[PDB]
Design a protein around this nucleic acid. Structure first.
Lengths: 227, 227, 227
DNA sequence: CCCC
DNA sequence: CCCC
DNA sequence: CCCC
């Protein structure tokens, strides 16, 4: 199988570890043996002008996934939303309310449907590629999530010297390592079968970085970098 | 403690990773230190004529567990169904409806009770051995689940040269290793305390096998073998 | 951040692995990098005269946490109860019933509020330190849980030769190591980022100890010691 | 809600 | 409830 | 539904 998946992840934290804004949206192409991605795109947001209550992330996600899909022609697109694998192009008010998701889950998706359902329908008529809301059960999504963490670290690397101090909240139970020329992100959950990512970047000088648990959010790590 | 447990696990997958049928039903004897099983039985199903909608699996389980229990005389039998550790022989509609399980779970078990409750009551009157539905809380069940994976791999080993290619979906977060004369199964979850299994088999030559994450079901591995 | 957290953990088990009573209540001070604690208190209960139905544990916890907090002046106190991080001092029946907790959870805390809510209000007016019910989401709480496991082993070490045999049920997925002069406790979940503890103690001789899974409670280990 |  |  |  060849799958394109997209996720938004990584957050700027204040000194009380409260999230300020999300950082990276990543679309990945995942192929056998489905442990990583060698082909991917990234779109950075502005964490300092980000609405956490708003759900722009998923609109960026589905767009970025399509952009990658039109180039690599995958079998399917995985969107990070656990709706039981329902096709976005089939998302109308009728089908949303019939899902066994929270009542709030239903509320949010009726508004997204105005743009995303026709968008998925046109793309399906073009390419025949479905865009399914599968969320947590999907490995390409989790791999995309790992890369979202890595690009958040890269974002921190590229932006540490203008802000002189950054706390980056990583996605769930993943760690990062920084080599001379690349960032390595790895899932901390061995049950996932060895999921990982790698992104080439120039690592700036005069910086020190640390990785430690978020004391307020168990199984979430914090990436801290200074000058 | 000496516990007999039984589980059905392992599935033949198509190339879209959709399960076709279940493979192995295994009953195990588990003793201190409760990390493995050295005494076990296996019953193979036909994955290509298997009904996933049906619940024959649990009927195969309770049969095989009893068959093994009559040989090794355990303290108790663990059946793989999370009902809070209630004895099967005590299953009437009143207590089933009083279980904190889904409405679909209740419907299924009310129909299962017709055969399974007298079966458990008769077995208890003979041997004094209870049959409890404990499921996820039981370690012997997980050990049985691991062996279901091991015997599923063995099934693939024995049937690969007639089918020239097989995708076997293993039970949750377990891996297998293939040595010269045996298959070794290990839980990928270190939290379970080092649970494993081991089964002797003649390993066919001229085969290639690979283990990788199921892209559609996170934390589930896929065993693929070809000629 | 400097956080004081408290948890009760560790249980004396009978030979059917059924818990008799809880052992150790521990309050810990946790600072960056939030992986362990170098400052902690322990209060022992009598497992053989313990009410498991009762909720003495949480009253011992909040008391012991305050005692330590009065000495080290932390930023906040973490109590082991998952109520979404709500301040205990604001817990009345009105806000309790508005919590997304079980019907049993509401009943228990409505009764606890009679004593604990004025206690939390009094402590907050004195020191300005909030006592929040964060529970499973807190890392300092988990560290306290690990030390509770360590002190349960210590309790067993100190009481083994008078009891001539002990089964100690540890907290979820943690292991212990016993050195010449200390007990080392480690989380078995790599997702938590390497949480651990250490307690110096005199180790009695002519004892043998073993660590293995509780066969009736998956992901819970058992500590057994004899003479 | 907590405990194994 | 179970299966991947 | 997502985010830490």
């Amino acid at each position: 199988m060849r799958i394109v998946a997209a996720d938004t992840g990584g957050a700027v934290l204040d000194e009380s570890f409260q999230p300020v804004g999300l950082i990276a949206t990543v679309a990945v192409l995942v192929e056998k043996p489905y442990k990583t991605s060698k082909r991917f795109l990234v779109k950075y947001a502005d964490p300092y002008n980000y609405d956490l209550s708003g759900r722009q992330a998923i609109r960026d996600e589905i767009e970025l996934a399509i952009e990658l899909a039109r180039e690599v022609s995958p079998d399917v697109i995985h969107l990070n939303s656990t709706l039981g694998g329902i096709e976005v192009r089939k998302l109308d008010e009728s089908t949303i309310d019939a899902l066994q998701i929270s009542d709030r889950g239903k509320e949010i998706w009726k508004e997204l449907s105005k743009d995303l359902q026709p968008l998925a329908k046109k793309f399906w008529e073009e390419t025949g590629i479905e865009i399914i809301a599968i969320g947590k059960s999907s490995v390409p999504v989790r791999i995309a999530e790992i890369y979202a963490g890595i690009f958040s670290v890269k974002w921190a690397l590229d932006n540490v010297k203008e802000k002189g101090g950054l706390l980056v909240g990583l996605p769930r139970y993943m760690e990062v390592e920084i080599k001379k020329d690349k960032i390595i992100g790895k899932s901390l959950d061995p049950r996932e079968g060895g999921l990982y990512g790698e992104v080439k970047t120039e690592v700036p000088q005069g910086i020190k970085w640390e990785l430690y648990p978020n004391p307020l959010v168990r199984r979430f790590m914090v990436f801290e970098i200074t000058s």
